[PDB]
Design a protein around this motif. Structure first.
Motif, PDB file in Angstrom:
ATOM      1  N   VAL A  32       0.881  -1.155   0.000  1.00  0.00           N
ATOM      2  CA  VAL A  32       0.000   0.000   0.000  1.00  0.00           C
ATOM      3  C   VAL A  32       0.923   1.210   0.000  1.00  0.00           C
ATOM      4  O   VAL A  32       1.510   1.556   1.029  1.00  0.00           O
ATOM      5  N   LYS A  33       1.093   1.807  -1.176  1.00  0.00           N
ATOM      6  CA  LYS A  33       1.960   2.965  -1.343  1.00  0.00           C
ATOM      7  C   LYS A  33       1.182   4.262  -1.527  1.00  0.00           C
ATOM      8  O   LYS A  33       0.540   4.475  -2.552  1.00  0.00           O
ATOM      9  N   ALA A  34       1.269   5.134  -0.528  1.00  0.00           N
ATOM     10  CA  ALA A  34       0.593   6.429  -0.564  1.00  0.00           C
ATOM     11  C   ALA A  34       1.514   7.527  -1.102  1.00  0.00           C
ATOM     12  O   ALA A  34       2.716   7.517  -0.838  1.00  0.00           O
ATOM     13  N   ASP A  35       0.947   8.465  -1.861  1.00  0.00           N
ATOM     14  CA  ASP A  35       1.718   9.582  -2.412  1.00  0.00           C
ATOM     15  C   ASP A  35       2.204  10.463  -1.268  1.00  0.00           C
ATOM     16  O   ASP A  35       3.400  10.716  -1.129  1.00  0.00           O
ATOM     17  N   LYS A  36       1.263  10.939  -0.459  1.00  0.00           N
ATOM     18  CA  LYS A  36       1.597  11.758   0.696  1.00  0.00           C
ATOM     19  C   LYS A  36       1.919  10.783   1.833  1.00  0.00           C
ATOM     20  O   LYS A  36       2.206   9.614   1.581  1.00  0.00           O
ATOM     21  N   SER A  37       1.887  11.250   3.075  1.00  0.00           N
ATOM     22  CA  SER A  37       2.186  10.383   4.214  1.00  0.00           C
ATOM     23  C   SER A  37       1.003   9.504   4.579  1.00  0.00           C
ATOM     24  O   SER A  37       1.149   8.528   5.310  1.00  0.00           O
ATOM     25  N   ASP A  38      -0.171   9.866   4.074  1.00  0.00           N
ATOM     26  CA  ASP A  38      -1.397   9.130   4.343  1.00  0.00           C
ATOM     27  C   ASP A  38      -2.203   8.853   3.086  1.00  0.00           C
ATOM     28  O   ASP A  38      -2.080   9.556   2.074  1.00  0.00           O
ATOM     29  N   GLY A  39      -3.043   7.831   3.169  1.00  0.00           N
ATOM     30  CA  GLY A  39      -3.873   7.465   2.042  1.00  0.00           C
ATOM     31  C   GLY A  39      -5.162   6.820   2.497  1.00  0.00           C
ATOM     32  O   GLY A  39      -5.363   6.593   3.694  1.00  0.00           O
ATOM     33  N   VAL A  40      -6.020   6.510   1.525  1.00  0.00           N
ATOM     34  CA  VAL A  40      -7.325   5.889   1.752  1.00  0.00           C
ATOM     35  C   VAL A  40      -7.547   4.867   0.633  1.00  0.00           C
ATOM     36  O   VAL A  40      -6.918   4.976  -0.413  1.00  0.00           O
ATOM     37  N   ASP A  41      -8.414   3.868   0.815  1.00  0.00           N
ATOM     38  CA  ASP A  41      -9.212   3.626   2.008  1.00  0.00           C
ATOM     39  C   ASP A  41      -8.801   2.337   2.712  1.00  0.00           C
ATOM     40  O   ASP A  41      -9.021   2.174   3.914  1.00  0.00           O
ATOM     41  N   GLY A  42      -8.264   1.400   1.941  1.00  0.00           N
ATOM     42  CA  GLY A  42      -7.843   0.134   2.499  1.00  0.00           C
ATOM     43  C   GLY A  42      -8.046  -1.021   1.539  1.00  0.00           C
ATOM     44  O   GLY A  42      -8.524  -0.852   0.416  1.00  0.00           O
ATOM     45  N   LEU A  43      -7.710  -2.208   2.021  1.00  0.00           N
ATOM     46  CA  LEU A  43      -7.808  -3.445   1.260  1.00  0.00           C
ATOM     47  C   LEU A  43      -8.467  -4.492   2.161  1.00  0.00           C
ATOM     48  O   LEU A  43      -8.386  -4.410   3.391  1.00  0.00           O
ATOM     49  N   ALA A  44      -9.086  -5.495   1.558  1.00  0.00           N
ATOM     50  CA  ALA A  44      -9.732  -6.536   2.338  1.00  0.00           C
ATOM     51  C   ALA A  44      -9.687  -7.892   1.662  1.00  0.00           C
ATOM     52  O   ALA A  44      -9.683  -7.983   0.429  1.00  0.00           O
ATOM     53  N   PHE A  45      -9.559  -8.938   2.476  1.00  0.00           N
ATOM     54  CA  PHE A  45      -9.603 -10.300   1.977  1.00  0.00           C
ATOM     55  C   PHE A  45     -10.987 -10.768   2.426  1.00  0.00           C
ATOM     56  O   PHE A  45     -11.361 -10.563   3.583  1.00  0.00           O
TER      57      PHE A  45
END
Ligand SMILES: CC(=O)N[C@@H]1[C@@H](O)[C@H](O)[C@@H](CO)O[C@H]1O
Ligand SMILES: CC(=O)N[C@@H]1[C@@H](O)[C@H](O)[C@@H](CO)O[C@H]1O
Ligand SMILES: CC(=O)N[C@@H]1[C@@H](O)[C@H](O)[C@@H](CO)O[C@H]1O
Ligand SMILES: *[C@@H]1O[C@H](CO)[C@@H](O)[C@H](O)[C@H]1NC(C)=O
Ligand SMILES: *[C@@H]1O[C@H](CO)[C@@H](O)[C@H](O)[C@H]1NC(C)=O
Ligand SMILES: *[C@@H]1O[C@H](CO)[C@@H](O)[C@H](O)[C@H]1NC(C)=O
Ligand SMILES: *[C@@H]1O[C@H](CO)[C@@H](O)[C@H](O)[C@H]1NC(C)=O
Ligand SMILES: [Ca+2]
Ligand SMILES: [Ca+2]
Ligand SMILES: [Ca+2]
Ligand SMILES: [Ca+2]
Ligand SMILES: [Mn+2]
Ligand SMILES: [Mn+2]
Ligand SMILES: [Mn+2]
Ligand SMILES: [Mn+2]
Lengths: 234, 236, 236, 236
Positions: D75-88
């Protein structure tokens, strides 16, 4: 670990991971009846719901696979029609138009078209020259490559109503396809091997399964598969 | 998951998970030479077992194990014929080569009698059938199912191909007590098959060792007994 | 297929494919008691290894094996506390218990020094951390990754539950040299985890033996070290 | 042998045994981008399922399947934070993305209610927990076990590492109804774990589809949701 590996010790009515085509279905006793049992002409195919990568165009690699299944062919009289087949065909292939029981719902005709893209191992019970002029003069096990006219056959000592255990292996490095059949009840065993280059015949993605047919309701027989194990690896 | 499952795509010199008995060893080319290859040639007997015993049946539950094995082997004779053969077998855990064994018995038997104390089940690929020395053999090279005796309970003509690689699949289905031997030569399509009923619980102890054995009784009619790869699975 | 894969849903008394060292044995109820459980309790040290060595890396190709193992164990103490712990380990093929080993070293070490000749990688479930006797341990029960020394390179607080069954999954991913230890208690949801970098090729020889070891240094603070089941797979 | 077992060391563009829903696809570099990655970033929702349904429990015998899965994701975010997530997740066979679903619900839910008709069990790797739009989330990035609702029944702090590869192992042990999530970052040793009790028979139908889902609700706070590999096994 290997790319794919599945095992069915028994089947369940309306099994979601098997695609039923034609008259194929699974009885309440847990057996896959690829051919309808009631009496009437029938054609049916059952495929595993997910396509399999038999070869990769990027790396050139070809998959080796092994499968094991037990089947029963019970005829009312001393003889029956038409046979059962294990096959590999293009992903999500449908039964061809104008197919017949003698072609196990795999072929539209008796020609050897490269566009068929089908490799199958047939357990042919009917060899009448009237309707199947391409067949040898006995019940047989045949390796079919793009045609209902087998490239190699061997006498099949069919036992009415008895369970047959089959092991089919395909070893990619030697392009060797071996069919091992045995009847645990009396020790009868038949074997056949042939060279087949999967990369030359099939597309990268294929569907595997069973097909069968009953062309004449008067000479009825069942084509039931009891269990099925399969593994493939690139 | 299954009780046991191992696979050797190739062997390595002095492989720690294989027990070498007699002249058995693995060459630098990665092949298991159960029989010695030397030139000057010589009489030889050898066996190679998987280092860990396997539970073939449980006395507590009564369960019997089903197993399947696959291996490729080559038998290359100098002349048109050779001796003596190769065998895949199941024997008591950590079994040693019997005293006074001979090549014709593949280092599995002390004699030609059918003693229940032998506790051996083997699938032989017999190349020598001379009546002078092996009176129990049929009149051709054969694949035989041996149960406590070098005199097979069932045999089948073995269309041996000199120097060619043979792929073998052996399956044992416990519920039907069925042992099937599937042999094929990818080079020309030659195939041989044989099946027989065998109750493992009646013949073998709970714990067994599996492996290969072979022999060369006459250095004058030398041939190799090399196994190239080996896959094995068992499950109770 | 993978090089090796074995599974024990239960153990059987005098199991031929497990090498018992010290006081290790399997009870009639089918559990592996690496530590002795007897009428009048006593000091104990024990190890159980899989009978066949495993190739953890190949010197010819340079390849390193990835492996995964899963086991369930129970540590039941009489009082609220017990000693000394249990460990899963990889050691040189057919390694024996070192001379002068103690329970606090789980029968894996002769001393507290970090000798490269030990050639041992172990995952310990340490119940005793008494500073005076085990000066190398942190101030709590812990899970530790041991590399050639009883002084773990990385530890994590282990929320041990007396008498409860713990399920453990240990994975080693060769390409990233990552060893992850996953522990959970199905009874209350308690979970502990720890991962560390370890280069197997740098620490161990090509052929190793895998198994469990454990000890009880003080019979007054007795506890069991029972493993209920064991799954293992390795692949080069 | 086990009922099902598949392994993807890498993915291939337009993989026929994976069903792509929404923006999910596989790049030319062989990675499954469940969420769309493009020059000018955009809102996205995507799901990828294994093409064949799996029998998670049998109504005839009452048996429930145990399963284990392993995958690595980034999970690579451009800024220091990102959205929304991943799920199995596990959902009804050949389930489609619900109408009116949002990124914060990972394309698994139509609303925040806990309807038993959803028939969904998922393990979320939630990166966005903003109380304005995700009032059900705790005050930190988390790993959550979701049962018929986006409001997790149990969560744990997820020490997310921007751009780093995470290895995950999820096991479900039927006999104890235990679901364990094991996460680790081989780069720095960071590890997170969580366990919860879930009765599959009570929540899901006999036939389910397994896969990954994810979303990006605000293009301004873009991040990737890439899965690198995937292993899966189930057994009744
Ligand atoms: C049009 C048609 O049904 N032809 C079938 C033929 O495929 C089959 O080989 C034969 C023997 O059963 O019976 C015929 O009726
Ligand atoms: C005592 C002895 O060595 N007997 C061997 C016999 O096992 C083998 O079948 C035969 C043919 O090679 O040669 C004999 O010398
Ligand atoms: C020489 C010896 O036995 N030392 C043990 C030590 O290994 C163990 O850590 C401690 C706690 O039980 O008890 C000591 O007696
Ligand atoms: C044979 O099958 C193919 C595929 O279904 C079809 O295109 C062709 O027209 C068929 N032959 C006839 C006579 O329908
Ligand atoms: C045969 O082998 C067995 C086992 O080594 C041994 O006890 C016996 O004495 C040997 N010789 C004969 C003639 O049986
Ligand atoms: C530690 O164990 C090794 C191996 O047994 C031994 O050589 C060494 O002498 C031992 N140390 C002591 C103090 O006995
Ligand atoms: C939520 O999704 C369900 C399942 O597809 C659907 O039936 C329902 O109508 C959706 N809710 C809304 C408001 O569309
Ligand atoms: Ca026919
Ligand atoms: Ca002979
Ligand atoms: Ca300690
Ligand atoms: Ca959220
Ligand atoms: Mn035919
Ligand atoms: Mn013989
Ligand atoms: Mn410690
Ligand atoms: Mn959440």
């Amino acid at each position: 670990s290997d790319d794919l590996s599945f095992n069915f010790d028994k089947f369940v009515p309306n099994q979601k991971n098997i695609i039923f085509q034609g008259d194929a279905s699974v009885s309440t006793t847990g057996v896959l009846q690829v051919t309808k049992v009631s009496t009437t002409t029938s054609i049916g195919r059952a495929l595993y719901a997910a396509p399999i990568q038999i070869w990769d165009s990027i790396t050139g690699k070809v998959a080796s696979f092994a499968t094991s299944f037990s089947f029963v062919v019970k005829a009312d009289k001393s003889d029956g029609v038409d046979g059962l087949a294990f096959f590999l065909a293009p992903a999500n292939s449908q039964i061809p138009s104008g197919s017949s029981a003698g072609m196990f719902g795999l072929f539209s005709s008796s020609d050897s078209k490269s566009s068929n893209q089908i490799i199958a191992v047939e357990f042919d019970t009917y060899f009448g020259k009237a309707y199947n002029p391409w067949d040898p003069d006995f019940k047989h096990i045949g390796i079919d490559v793009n045609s209902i006219k087998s490239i190699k056959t061997v006498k099949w000592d069919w036992r009415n109503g008895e369970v047959a255990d089959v092991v089919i292996t395909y070893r990619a490095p030697t392009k060797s396809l071996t069919v091992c059949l045995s009847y645990p009840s009396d020790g009868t065993s038949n074997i056949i091997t042939a060279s087949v280059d999967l990369k030359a015949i099939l597309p990268e993605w294929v569907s595997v399964g069973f097909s069968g047919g009953v062309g004449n309701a008067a000479e009825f027989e069942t084509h039931d598969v009891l269990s099925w194990y399969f593994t493939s690896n690139l």
